[PDB]
Structures are given as structure tokens and as C-alpha cells.
A paper describes a structure:
Cryo-grids were prepared using a reaction mixture of nucleotide-free V/A-[name], containing the regenerating system and ATP at a saturating concentration of 6 mM. The reaction mixture was incubated for 120 s at 25 °C and then loaded onto a holey grid, followed by flash freezing. In these structures, nucleotide densities have been identified in the three catalytic sites. Hereafter, we refer to the structures obtained at ATP saturating conditions as V3nuc. The catalytic sites in the ABclosed and ABsemi in both the state and state also contained density corresponding to an ATP molecule, and in these cases, the associated magnesium ions were visible. In the V2nuc and V3nuc, two sub-states, state and state were identified. V3nuc in state and state are also in equilibrium. The V3nuc structure, obtained under ATP saturation conditions shows all three catalytic sites occupied by ATP or the products of hydrolysis (ADP + Pi).
The V1 domain of Tth V/A-[name] (A3B3D1F1) is an ATP-driven rotary motor where the central DF shaft rotates inside the hexameric A3B3 containing three catalytic sites, each composed of an AB dimer. When powered by ATP hydrolysis, the V1 domain rotates the central rotor against the A3B3 hexamer, composed of three catalytic AB dimers adopting different conformations (ABopen, ABsemi, and ABclosed). Here, we report the atomic models of 18 catalytic intermediates of the V1 domain of V/A-[name] under different reaction conditions, determined by single particle cryo-EM.
Numbering used by the authors:
A (entry chain D): 5 to 474
B (entry chain E): 3 to 319
C (entry chain G): 169 to 209
D (entry chain I): 81 to 120
E (entry chain J): 61 to 187
F (entry chain B): 1 to 578
G (entry chain C): 194 to 386
Write the structure that this text describes.
Amino acid sequence: KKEYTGITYISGPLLFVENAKDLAYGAIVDIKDGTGRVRGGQVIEVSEEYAVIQVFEETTGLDLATTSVSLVEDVARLGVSKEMLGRRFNGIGKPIDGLPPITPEKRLPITGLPLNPVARRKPEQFIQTGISTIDVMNTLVRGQKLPIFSGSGLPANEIAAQIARQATVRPDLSGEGEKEEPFAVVFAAMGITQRELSYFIQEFERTGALSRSVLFLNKADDPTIERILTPRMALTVAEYLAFEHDYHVLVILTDMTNYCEALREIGAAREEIPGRRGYPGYMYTDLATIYERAGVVEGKKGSVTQIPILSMPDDDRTHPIPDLTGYITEGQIQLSRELHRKGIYPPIDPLPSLSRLMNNGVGKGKTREDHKQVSDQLYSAYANGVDIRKLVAIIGEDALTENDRRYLQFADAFERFFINQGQQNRSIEESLQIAWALLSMLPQGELKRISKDHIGKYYGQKLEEIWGAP
Amino acid sequence: LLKKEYTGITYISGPLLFVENAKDLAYGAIVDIKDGTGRVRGGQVIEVSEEYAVIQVFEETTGLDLATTSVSLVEDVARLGVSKEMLGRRFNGIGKPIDGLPPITPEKRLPITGLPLNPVARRKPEQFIQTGISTIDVMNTLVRGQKLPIFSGSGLPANEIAAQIARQATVRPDLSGEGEKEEPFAVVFAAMGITQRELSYFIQEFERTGALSRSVLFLNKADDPTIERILTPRMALTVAEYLAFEHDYHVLVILTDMTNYCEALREIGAAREEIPGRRGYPGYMYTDLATIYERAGVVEGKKGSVTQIPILSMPDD
Amino acid sequence: IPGIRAQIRFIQQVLEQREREDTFRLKRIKGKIEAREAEEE
Amino acid sequence: TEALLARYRERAEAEAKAVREKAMARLDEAVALVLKEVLP
Amino acid sequence: ESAGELLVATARTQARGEVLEEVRRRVREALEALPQKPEWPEVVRKLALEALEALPGAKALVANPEDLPHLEALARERGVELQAEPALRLGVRAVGAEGKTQVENSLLARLDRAWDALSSKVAQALW
Amino acid sequence: MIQGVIQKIAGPAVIAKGMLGARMYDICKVGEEGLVGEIIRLDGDTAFVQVYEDTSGLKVGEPVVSTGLPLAVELGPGMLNGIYDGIQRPLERIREKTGIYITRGVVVHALDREKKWAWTPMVKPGDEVRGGMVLGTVPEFGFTHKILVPPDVRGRVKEVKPAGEYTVEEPVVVLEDGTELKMYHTWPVRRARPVQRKLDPNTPFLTGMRILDVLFPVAMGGTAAIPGPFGAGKSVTQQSLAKWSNADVVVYVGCGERGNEMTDVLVEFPELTDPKTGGPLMHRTVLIANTSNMPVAAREASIYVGVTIAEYFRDQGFSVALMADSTSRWAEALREISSRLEEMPAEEGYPPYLAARLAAFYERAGKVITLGGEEGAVTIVGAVSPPGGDMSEPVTQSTLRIVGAFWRLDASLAFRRHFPAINWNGSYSLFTSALDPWYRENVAEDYPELRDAISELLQREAGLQEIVQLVGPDALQDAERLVIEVGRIIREDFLQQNAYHEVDAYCSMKKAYGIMKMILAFYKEAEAAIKRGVSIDEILQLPVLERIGRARYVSEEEFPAYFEEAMKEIQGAFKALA
Amino acid sequence: PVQRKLDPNTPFLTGMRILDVLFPVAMGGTAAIPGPFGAGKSVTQQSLAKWSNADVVVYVGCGERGNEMTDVLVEFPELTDPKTGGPLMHRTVLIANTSNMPVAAREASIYVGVTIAEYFRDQGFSVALMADSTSRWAEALREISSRLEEMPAEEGYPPYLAARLAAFYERAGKVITLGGEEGAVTIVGAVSP
Ligand SMILES: Nc1ncnc2c1ncn2[C@@H]1O[C@H](COP(=O)(O)OP(=O)(O)OP(=O)(O)O)[C@@H](O)[C@H]1O
Ligand SMILES: Nc1ncnc2c1ncn2[C@@H]1O[C@H](COP(=O)(O)OP(=O)(O)OP(=O)(O)O)[C@@H](O)[C@H]1O
Ligand SMILES: [Mg+2]
């Protein structure tokens, strides 16, 4: 038990310790003062003359006469096991549910290694999230990175909780290989407040989704380094489960903006020169080291899917955070403030949304066969109706062509029934039935994007939303 | 003379190296940097003190080490050997032949930075140049001794216009009443960061016209070291001034791309850690560009003249 | 539209220039402080 | 035409001998001139 | 049509260059015979004197091992040390007080440093 | 070699001591794990080494060893059909060694040392040799891989190895001065390989696509740029370029793409088949792959490694096409590296030397006379991905100042099902005038004027779109309606091309010249018909239009007779019908 | 030093309609004429030098082209002084420090010119002073501050630039000389933003 004394400098978050050549770079240490309190810290620089330690929390009681520093871990590691399902942790693996600590199968470095590009394979199967706007028009594929773009006051947390509650695979629709693999959710929260914490805890406990998920929760008052470490802990757990026990893992990261701000504060703490717009110059690489840990691997059945969630600072898509996220990921889901204020939940806006991997996870053998054509027709019709809603305000309704009234009614009913699904959970077939019922309001022959055989199979149905799509 | 070798190199980083005990190096002197393998590359002293001297390397510092490298003085101020036999030759932009012919025999050695012309020694330009283009001749007339750049863009054909101007230029003595028939212009052509396509176009057009026997070329290709791009216009203008004001030639100087020169200047200034200008460029860019552009003109009591037609591309128009 | 685009371009250029000036001053003062703390000792 | 080119080539190969014939008459004098200056 | 004129020009330029290279070759070959002939005792002494004058704080004087019968007396004249290096034939070099600065005064260096002015001068005599 | 110890660790930067004699930009191995790094600064007995990989767990005092050589690649047999990272590491061997992950400190050889090769000597003892000459031949997937003496090696041959099966490591030719030459050598990636002379671009780089070939051609050894908007067919166009180009060898460089994009290109390629031999297309290609989470230094050095390999294959006397998947991501990596070194940013955060690096990379392309007396060329097509499709971004501006061609892909045309989706507005080529004499000598004496006629017809169609939008096409005069219909004919019959059709995916110059001749003949006869009195809607139903539309999808050997019949039909029809 | 400063009440006639009518400048006043390149600063200043009622004209070519100073030398002796009827150059003093001349002399040229103007004012004359470009003087100050390793304020300019400009411009005005006579100095400075 070697303990280091002889602190020579304390100021802000840093303290200098001499004769500490044995400390490895990046090691985690424990700082204990004269009152017996123990604080945490990480070694950020090692030299022959001294080592520089960044303290996790405040340095209120420290002094140069009695403070001592002791090693804990040479490199940050996390104990993992299949029994972590149903637990809650504080972002550095410390349990907060009041249950006994887990018994680890192994200890893994939280800074995971990159995947070999020749070991990857193409995503082929989708995930049913239970939201019609996502499943039908912006389908999520196993192994995709599909972030959600939200505003400041928009209900992104509710959507995250709902997706975590309703997400499941559909091995039945595959036709052959009709057997389900185990499914799990890894939930990471960064820089959340007390109200959000209570809401998430209650939402996970009330439905029983806790028994099938792992929660990593980091609060706003917690140390910033823990905010940095939390997504890496979550992704380490996700990779372990998926590629050792053949689980299908869905990973949800909340408020990547908080992570970016934490990274900016950490960078300013090390006296690094800030890059463009105040963020560190290596921000793109840092974000890539998080996002690029998802995917599917040859010779293994498990998979990792990521749904980052971030709030744009000024609703400006040109901000560095959403810009880099768009560079790295494969699309985005956009929330609309107008839809939220009109009372429509979930307020997902289909027009500015996109999923780049959608075409590879839908169609015959994967989902119902008419998926892509129906999605295209819905997008075209909604886009055509939205501008007529504006034109009517100046030319009047009576001046419209007859088909324009149909387009207006289609847009209104689409907003009322398709997007505004509330808290209910819809399968893929039910969402497609609702879509076909909405399309049936348009005249046959205006469906230029759909083949005639599909129309003959599915055209001509009234609204199933009131019926509940039996 | 005899050479002095300095082996006390203290610090190498980027384009700069420090020599420790070199109190004898004059400010602005040119040096030779020899490494362990025997390869010799050039440099220039940009700051000298009792503690050390600062030498800026003309090319990349790959392969240099503190154990075997040595520095030798060449001359106190950069000089170029000039002669009338330079006409019809081709150079690489540092003063070295590339057309395969033996090096010239210098008639004189002159400092490349030149000296400012005394304002009371100049005379006002008066001679009309007919370039054969109505838009210039009637509306934007060019006169011998003027410096008249061309502002262009990425895809615009500035090079073709320059070639046409060089081909069609004349003096028209009859209108001015001079009466004296005059020789055609000698062309000094300097290229900075030029590509193979444009270089081939210019060379072929000059061959077709037949003006190579009257021309001197300093060619700095785009894959050449960036630091050497600074010295090319100064060498070209030294040659032009020598010809015009010691052999009564009428010289027409064409500078291929001043944008590359400015980019090289910014790259140097960033490493030197100077006060930036309006968009990252060094604060002294105006003076540096002036020391190049102001070398044109005509001199009272002499017959020769220097005319400059620089070419630059406006970024994003 | 062209007037608005010109205004946007001008404002972007001014903001970028101010950011660069602040970065340069910060680097200069940090270098001076580091010199005092490490070369002079 | 090509006959003028042949005449010019003849002139060039005549000059390539005339120049060295001129030079060979005083070469050692220049050697002594250089040697008396390079040596201390 | 000017192709013949340029051919004449390049032919005469190449001929002049080939004449000058032969001139410098004869100069250097004649210069090489100085250590073999009884001419070294004064030229090497003068080169050493120039080297010592150029670098006042000289510590040692590295020169030709064949000049040691003269160096063993000429070094103590100035009071500096002496060393020998066979690779430095036809030259004397003096190191600095710390050894970081060295002056080299070989005849080959003198020739290759004056050769530009000498090439300018010889054209007056040959043509 | 120079060996020292660590005295300070700070992120990826490591400060060593006792390393006097280390040279700038040499490769160093840090710690007992042997992490590779680069020397960036020297002072006193101290060297600054920038470690490529992560440095967690390192301790002060671990040894540092310098290799004494800069970053370089191995050039020899065994590079074809392989997949490499940004610093030439075989990914398949890495997978077979360490599983699905890439662990820190793995060492593997670029060229397989175990496989035997069939040597066939060409030199004999006592022959004087000089850099660039051919020492012998080895077969490699149907190629005659010529072993080249290294560019700087010179001497006389003392011993030659007799023909037989040998490994790469075995010395094959020994010079009199004791130097040994084997089947491979090493060359620094940041120094251009020497050549005898650069020849001017005088022959076209036949891409096989009519739009590219006729309206915006690129010369052999030329350079081009292409935007990368999503859903525009960029991947399909690049794949078609790889499949159908004149180039003998294809080099593809991925330098920081998304994981799924790299997976797509890694899976699609092994299925392709080149038309020249019908075998796998992978037998002619070298793949360099980089994902976003790979080290920054590999991403930065990827394009240099790729262009060095391309230059080597050019030195073997071949014609090579080089595609860079996104120079924007490489510029991002360069900016990150510059920020690491605490340099002063110039504009939008990029280092001041970005344009110099781009120009130095693009200038390696060209058609040259090799040191062995043969002829070769390297053609570079680089994709640029600005942030918002805005070409005022500094990387795009720097690229457009040196490339000779620009091919503006547009997403709107792809959304309109016009493929390939390349605008004729904004796109431009600087090689047209220089290539015109070759066109007149080779394809037809009237090719340039005919192409100009096509361009003028397109411009006339574009010059009246406002009235068409305001009013509609049917409410137009005969002349304007005929012009717009001829423009539609051009767009849908000559510009469009199907990359999945057996005989339409490739189109020669003669075929395009015939199509243009037919279109101009029809237009001129229709203008004459209007002069002599006709209604345009009558002209719209002439079967010669259906003949011209079906002029595609025909075999190239069938094309001359089809063209003659179509011309005769065009001449006859406009006299039989008004 | 001067005895007393007076309020200006007489116009400085520049010979140009727009300047003399819409935007007059008094004898003891100061005027600034900024504009982009090619706008006409130098031509306007030379026109004021040729056509004006001032007794003595002092022209300071701070960091500009040499041809602009050569033209004056060549052509002014051929012109006529509007008041005295003699050669125009007999009333003119030229201080020339061109662009490629040493940078630090730009600062000194301004002070030399203004001191000469003040001397001729003390003799009892009315003097007009033309400063060709103060932006070059500011650039020289920026360069000197760069060598001094000071801290820049705005666009690299030293924090004391405004004080220097104010001190230069405050030397103008109509005064009562120590000899009891009356004189004035008019300063017209050009700026190149
Ligand atoms: N010239 C073409 N001929 C035939 N099909 C094409 C052509 N160009 C694009 N396509 C079609 O588009 C497909 C892939 O390209 P797409 O237009 O979807 O954009 P992308 O290449 O996927 O996106 P990105 O350009 O960002 O890589 C193929 O399925 C193909 O059928
Ligand atoms: N009042 C004027 N009458 C006629 N021409 C004028 C006048 N003012 C300016 N010009 C024209 O402008 C050109 C000279 O402009 P001038 O040199 O005054 O610009 P400037 O503001 O001094 O720019 P810079 O400071 O960059 O030199 C000449 O071609 C001249 O004909
Ligand atoms: Mg002016």
C-alpha cells in the first residue's frame, strides 16, 4: 500500500504531487485530507519532477501539509456480468439502487478498441420501436446510428423513455429462422436534473422494463469527469453483452450536448487551446470514438444499435455538435416545435427526417412487402398538402382544384391520426394499415409511387385508428 | 575565401533551427545546412543574437539531427549572378538551370532585394502600348513602366489573356512622333505554384510565337518547396532591372500567381509567430508586396523600362 | 435575397475575425506566462 | 524548308569546333591565372 | 525557322561549358601536385595562419599528418594544440574554444568558392 | 540505434531524453508495447515523439527506440487483391491474429513473406544497371509484375538468381559493390518518385460514360473533383469508373468514412467482375480503408500511401486510376493534427498550409516517361464533401484552384431519375481544347463542332425555362416547342445511361459521335420542315424518333449499320412527312 | 507653443464645388477623407494642393507610390501659383517616404511635416497640410509593437493608436503667434480602410 505525500501546488481542479514516477498516465487515484474524507482524481500528466492530478470534486478542505495521494487503478476498468440487468449505476459503476454490488465475470477497459472493418457485415434487420412515424417512414435498422434532434423545451425524455419501453425485435416476420434472440436496453443519462431522474426511475419501474435494461445515470451536480466516463461505461456493457451473450442491445444516449459541454470544460481545465467556436479541436475524433462502437459482426448473432439524443443550442443545425453528429451518423429524427405547440405527441416531423439505412432493412422477407413504396407515397402526399395549407390562406378554399381539397384533408387526417398516436404502442402491421387507410382518402390513380397490384391488394379502407386496427 | 562550420545546433522544430555559438552570422545572410548523409539544403538568418541565431530552412527539415548537422556561411546578403546570356535560358526559381545547359558565367552579382528608386530619379511614363485589345487600349490604356495586374478567378482564362498580351504588344512610334523603330519586348516570366497543365500551355504558346530567344523563365512548380516561392519574384525582378537599366532593354514582366506567394507568406508568418492581419495574413504583407511591385518604372536619363503584369485569382471572387 | 446573403456573409466574417483575434491574444499571454514560469524559473 | 535546317545544323557543328579551336590557344594561361589566385 | 538559330546557340553554349570544365579540371589537377612537390612548407603555413587569424579563440589545429614536421613548430608559435586527420589532405582546419565553430582552409574549398569569379574572369582571356 | 527513455507523458505527446542523434520525422517505438510514433521536434538531448495510438498505462522511464527511417511503404509483389489500413497494414492478417478487434501494438508485414513467386530473370552478370530498370518478371493475377531496381541504386550486376520459385525476402540480384536487391524495396511516402519527364496531357481518360466523355472529359494523367451528396449515385459512378475505365490498375482510398459505408464498399467489391477478363475485379485493385475511429495519423497518411502505390504501379509502365473517397475527411484529420501541435489556424480553423498539401498531393498525377524508358500515367479523381453543399468552404476553394475538371453531382437529377445525376451547369473541364486535336485525328474531324452544337442546344433549352414555368409547354410557338423537345430528346437519349444494362453501361466515342450526328440531322431537318410549313405535333410522331431513342442498348459492332439506317430514315422521313 | 487659439471663421477654399458648398472646412479646421482603393483620395489631395488659397502647402507622402511623388516634381514647376502668380512649386514642401522605403520612417515623416507646417504658421502664413495615408503610419506602429512583444487591442493595432492620432490632429487650428501675428494650419488626412 504505497501512498504519496508532498503536494506542492493546489489551484482549481489540479494538484501537483512530487516523487510520483510510479503513477501511470491516466491512472485513477484517491485523495485523502486531514479530516479523513476521501476524494477521487485522475492523473492527466506524468513527469520526472511531478505528476498532475485532476480532482473529480471540489478541493475545499485540502492543504499541502497533510494531504496524501494513493493509487487505485492503473487504467479505468469496469466489472461486467450478465446479472447487471435490472440495476442502476451512478456513471462510474457505483450502484445507486441500494442493492448489493455485482460479482464481476471480468474487468474490461472502458476505452474499447476499434472494430476491424473486415469483421463488419451489412445491417439487414429492423427494430420495431412502436412509433408509426419511425417504423414506417424512418425505419431503424439493427446496427444503425440514428440520432434524434430536439429543441430546448421539447419532450425528448418522454420519447426516449417510450422507445426504451416499447422497443422489440420481430423474428416472426423473418419467415425463416423464426426464433428470437434475447433483447436488452442500455440507458445512459448525462447531466440530467432531479426531476428528469425521478421521471425516468418511475417510468422504468411502473412497466417492468427495468428487468430488461441497465441504467447509467449522471446528474448535473456530479463531477464532470463522470459525465465524460458514463457513455464509455454504457458502451462497454453493451459491447460485452452483445458480443459475448448474443444479445440484441439498444443503446440510448441522452443530451450529447451536455457531454460536449463537459468535454469543453475538461479541455479548458488542461490548458488546451480551444478550437473553432470554443470546442476542442479533437471533438470530431472523440465523438467518433463513441458513435462508431455500434454495428453487427460476422459470425455473431448479437448487435448494438445507438440512438443518440441531443438538443440543438439555438435550433441551429450549423452548430458544431449537430454538424459533426451528422457527419458521423446515418441520419436523424427531427422534432417540430409547431407540432408540439399544436398538441401533437410525439412531435416527430417527417419532412426533415431521414434514415440512410432504411432501404436495407425493409421489404420482402424482412417486413411487409409494400413498405418502401407506401413510405414514399406518404412523404409525397404530406409534402404536397403542407404547402396547400398555406396557399389556401391567400386564395381561399373555394378557389382550389378538387384534388387540392383531398390533399388538405389528407394532411389534416395524417397529422391527427398517424403522428398523434399518444402513449399507445403500435406494431408494424397496424401502422401500415393506418397508412393505407389514410392513403385510401386520395383518389386511386394519384398513387404514382405504388404499383397497381399493391393498390389492388390494400386500397379501400376507412380509418382504423378509431377501430384500433383489429 | 575559406569556410566556417557551425556545429552548435540547439533546437529544430518546423521550418526553424537554432544555432548556438554563431555570433558571426550577419542578419539576413544565406547559409548551407549539411546533414549526415551529405545532402545540402539552403537557409536564411532571420534573427541573430548573442545567445543564438535563427535560421529559416528553405525546404522541409526531414532527416536533420543535432549530432551531425553543420551550418556554413555562404554570403552576407543574398545575391544572384546576372548576364545578357540569361536570355533563352530556363531556371527553377532559385537561380539554378534546369534546361540541361551549363551554368552561366556571371557578369555581376546583385542583391535580390534590390534598392528603392530615388523619386527624383524617376520620370513620368508617357509611351502608349497597343496590346491589340480594345477594352484595354481604349478604356484602360497601358503605358510603359506601369504595373497593371489582372484579377481573375478559378475557371477564368487569365493565362490566355496574358499570353495574348505578350504576343500582341507593340509601341506604335509613328503616332507619338518618335519615328524610331524599336526592338520587341523581352519577357521575364516567373511562375509560383504553377501546375503542369498551365506550364505546358505557356511553354507551347511561347514556342509557337518564337519568343523564347527573348525570354527568361523562373519556374517554381506546385510540388516544389513552399519557402522557395518567396525568392522567385525577387530574382525575376533583379534580372529585369539589370537588363532594362544596364542594357536599355524594354522588359515586360509577368508574375503567374501572386495568390500562391501570399499563401506562402502566410505560412511563414504563422510559424514565425507574428501579429496577424485581417484574415490571418501577416501584418506586414503590404510592405512585402510593395517591395516587389514598386520595382517597375522608368528612369530619367535612361532608355530602358520595366512593365509588370501580375496575375492573381480572387478567392471566391 | 442577395442583400440578406451579403449581410450574413459580412457578419460571419466579422465574428470569425474576432474569434481569431481572441485566440491569438490568449496564446500570446499563455506563452508569456509559460516563459516566466519555466525559462526564468 | 528542311534544307535551311540542314544548313543551320552545318553551321552549328562548325561553331562547335570553331569555339574550342579559339579556346585551345590560351587555355594554360587561364589555368595559371586561376592557380595564382586560388593559392595563398 | 528559328530552330536552327537555337541549335547554333545551344551548340556554342555547350562548347563553352565544356571548355570551362576542362580549364577547371586542369587547374585542380595542377593544384593537386603541391603536396607531392616541395611546395607545401609555405602554402600550408600560410593557410594555417589564415585559419588562426580568422578564428581568434582557436583551441586546436587539425591539419595534414604530412605537415607535422612543420606543424610541430608552427603550432607552438601560436600556442594551440595540433591534431592530424588523413581525410583532410591539402587543408588546415582550426576548431573553436568549445569546438562548436570550425574554420576550414583547404585549397579545394578555395577553388570551389572562387570559381564563380574566376569563370567570369577567364572568359576575358579565352574570348 | 538511438535508444532513450521517457521523461514526460501528456496525452498522445511523449517527451524522451537521451535521444541525441535522432532525426526529424523518424519512426520511433515507445514503451515495451512498441507503440509507433513520429519525431516532430528536437532540442538538446530531448526529442518530441507524437504517438499514433492511445498512451494509457504508460509510465515514465520506459525505453524508446528510433528506427532511423521516416514513414514508408513496401513496394513489391503481393499488393493486389489486398485490403490495407492508412499505414499499409493488412486487415485480414490482423483479424486472423487478434480476432474482431484491433489491439494496440500489433506488428504484421505488408507483403506476405511465406508465399513463393515464379522468378524469371532478365539481366545477366556484368550488366551495368541504373535505377528504374527491370530486373525480372513475376506473374501476379495475370499481370507481369516487373521487379524494378530502386531509383537510387546504381552499379553493375555481379550475380543473378536462376529462374525458379522464391520468396519475397530472398536476394535475387547482387551488385559488385555488395548491395543486394530483392523483390521489394522501401520508399518514403512524402517524397515523389522520380521520372525522366512529364508529358503533356494529349489523350483522353476514357471513363465509359457519355456525359463525362463528351461534355466534361478528363485527360490521361489529369485531375477531377466531384461532390458527394447523399442519394446521388456517387458510389455507383465511382464503381462504374473502376469497372470500365481505360486504367489497368485501380487504387481506392478510404480516409475516414463511416463504418457502414466502408462495410458496403468492402462487401460490394468482391462480387464485381471486370469486363476485360471476366474474373474478379478485385484482382486489379488495392483497397485502403479507414473508419472514423481509427487513429488520426493513419487517416492523414492514407492518401500519401495510396498515391505512392499508384506511382509505383505507374513506374511499372501501367495506367492507374486513383480515387480518394473524401478529401474533406482528410482535411479534417489534418486540422486535428495541426490543432494538436498548437499551431495558429488560418481560416475556418484549418492550418495555413492546407492548399500547399492539396497541391502537392494532386501534382503527383500525370503522364510521364518512366526511368525505365516506358510510359505510364496516374489519374486522380477526388471527392469533396462540403458541410452544407456550399462550395465556398475553404477545402473546395483550394481544390478548384488546381484541378482541371469539376463534375457537379446533383441530388435533384437523381430524384428525377436522370442517371448519372451530373448537371451540365456548373460542371466544367479545362482539357477540352487540348484534347480536341486528338479527337479530330482519332474519332472524327467534325467532333468538336458537333459537341458544341449539342452544348448550344442544351443552353438554348435552359435559356427559356422561365416562360415554360410561367405558361406551360403546350402554349408555345413551333420554334420554341421544337427546341425544348430536342433538348428533351438529348437529355433522355444521349446524356442518360444505365449502369446495370449489359451494353449501355459502356459507350465508345464513335457511338456518341453517331448519336450526336443523328440528333443534329433530325434538328436541322425539323427546322427546314418548319421553314417549309409544318406543325410540331406532327413531327413528334415520326418513327425516326423511336429509332433514335432505341439507338442505345445496341451492340457497338452493330452500331455502324444501325447509324447508317437511322441517317437514311431521317433523310427520307422529313420528305415523306411534312 | 502659441499665444492663443481662435475660433475659425473663414473658409478654406479647395476649388471643388461639392467640398466648398456642401461640406465646407474652415482655415483652422481638420478634415478626413477615407475611401477604398481607386476612389480618388490622392487626386483630391493633389487638386487641393494645386487650387487653394493657402500660402504654403506641405504634402506628406507617407507610404505611397513613388510615381505620385514624381508627377508633382515633374509638373508643379510648370504651373502657376493662384495668388502670387509665380511657379507653383515655390510654395510647396514635399516629404516623401514611399512604400518600399524603410517602415519606421513613416512615423517620422508625419511629425517632420507637421512641425514644418507649425513653423510656417509661426511665421504668420496660412498653411495647408496633406497627409497621404495615415493607415500606413498605423501599420508602422503595429509593426513596431509586434517587435516589442506588446499586446494588441484591435486588429493588431497597439492600444495607444487613438492617442497618437489625436495628438497629431490637435496641432491644427488658427492661432495668435508669439510674435503677435495671426496664422493657421489646415490638416486634411486620408485614410485607407
Ligand atoms: N447511373 C445509374 N444507373 C443506374 N442506377 C443508378 C445510377 N445512379 C444511381 N443509381 C441507383 O441508385 C443506387 C445507389 O445510389 P443512390 O442514388 O441511392 O445514392 P448513393 O450512392 O446510395 O448515396 P451516396 O451518393 O451518398 O453514396 C443504386 O441502387 C442504383 O440503382
Ligand atoms: N476628380 C477626378 N477627376 C478625374 N479622375 C479622377 C478623379 N478622382 C479620381 N479619378 C480617377 O481615379 C484614378 C486615380 O484615383 P486615386 O489615385 O485618387 O485613388 P486613391 O483613392 O488615391 O486610391 P489609392 O489610395 O489606393 O491610390 C485615376 O484614373 C483618375 O482618373
Ligand atoms: Mg493614392
